[PDB]
Structure 1
Amino acid sequence: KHSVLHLVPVNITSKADSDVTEVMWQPVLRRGRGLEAQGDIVRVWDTGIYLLYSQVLFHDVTFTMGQVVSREGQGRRETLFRCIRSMPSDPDRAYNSCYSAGVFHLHQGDIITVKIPRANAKLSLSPHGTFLGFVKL
């Protein structure tokens, strides 16, 4: 039976002097045992092929917004996918969701990160606006 993990936001972090915003995740659906949310990252415990999907809902007039999903393991970082959305300059118009997904080989011990490469990014913490999930194939 396929392992699944669907995550929604519980908080947001953007360190001072950084140009990055990250989401703290909490599980809302889990079957099987090969992945574990650890705050702003997800730990891979079982090597395999996974479907990874990520949506972020932005309410931000910054010229482009989006997210970068990466895997880090064995001293290396690999970008799996990026989603990019141009935003309007008027705040009442500046709402856009950004969805992307794909199938990737992940190794035991890897860390998956979802980063918005802007400081203090204005994203929704709504569980139906911003979310992250995994299906082991």
Structure 2
Amino acid sequence: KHSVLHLVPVNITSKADSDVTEVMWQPVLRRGRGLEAQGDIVRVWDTGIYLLYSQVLFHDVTFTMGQVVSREGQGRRETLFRCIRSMPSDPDRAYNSCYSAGVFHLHQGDIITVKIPRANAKLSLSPHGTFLGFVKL
């Protein structure tokens, strides 16, 4: 039966002197042991084809927000998918969720990350606003 995982934000992080914001995740649903949450990053234990889905909810007025979902493994990297949202100029209208997902061969030893390509991006910690999840197929 399918290993699965659904994750929600515990905390947000964006180290000084870089233009990236990451999310620290915590599991709310779990089946199997082929994946594991580890602070800001999710480790893959079982090689295999996974459905990977990510939503982040933004409020910045700056041009164009979104996320980059990636895998990293054996000194390597591969951007799996991005989600791009244009935000409007008026701060009260400036709310958008950005959902993207896809099916990827993920390898044992891979760290999966979700990065917002801006420093200190204003994004929701709400469990039903920003999330990340896995289904082994």
Displacement of 1:37 in angstroms is: 0.7
Aligned match of 1:12 = 12
Specify the SS of the correspondent of 1:120: coil
Distance in 2 separating the partners of 1:25 and 1:113: 10
Aligned match of 2:104 = 104
Distance in 1 separating the partners of 2:91 and 2:28: 31
Q: Tell me if 1:45 matches 2:41.
A: no
Unaligned stretches of 5+ in structure 1? none
C-alpha deviations, 1:77-136, integer Å up to 9, x for none? Answer: 100000000000111000000000000000000100100000000000000000000000
Displacement of 1:62 in angstroms is: 1.1
Distance in 2 separating the partners of 1:59 and 1:126: 13
Specify the SS of the correspondent of 1:129: coil
Distance in 1 separating the partners of 2:100 and 2:88: 21
Q: Tell me if 1:135 matches 2:135.
A: yes
Aligned match of 1:80 = 80
**Normalization by structure 2: what TM-score?**
0.99
Aligned match of 2:69 = 69
Aligned match of 1:58 = 58
Specify the SS of the correspondent of 1:122: coil
Size of the aligned set, in residue pairs, is 137
Q: Percent of aligned pairs with the same residue?
A: 100
Displacement of 1:74 in angstroms is: 1.0
Distance in 1 separating the partners of 2:75 and 2:15: 23
Distance in 2 separating the partners of 1:95 and 1:81: 22
C-alpha deviations, 1:34-72, integer Å up to 9, x for none? Answer: 000111100001100000000000011011000000000
C-alpha deviations, 1:4-47, integer Å up to 9, x for none? Answer: 10000000000000100001000000010000011110000110
Distance in 1 separating the partners of 2:87 and 2:40: 25
Q: Aligned ranges for residues 113-128 of structure 1 at < 5 Å?
A: 113-128=113-128
Distance in 2 separating the partners of 1:58 and 1:35: 27
Distance in 2 separating the partners of 1:5 and 1:118: 27
Distance in 2 separating the partners of 1:7 and 1:62: 27
Q: Aligned ranges for residues 27-46 of structure 1 at < 5 Å?
A: 27-46=27-46
* Structure 1 stretches of 4+ moved >2 Å: none
RMSD: 0.4
Distance in 2 separating the partners of 1:47 and 1:63: 38
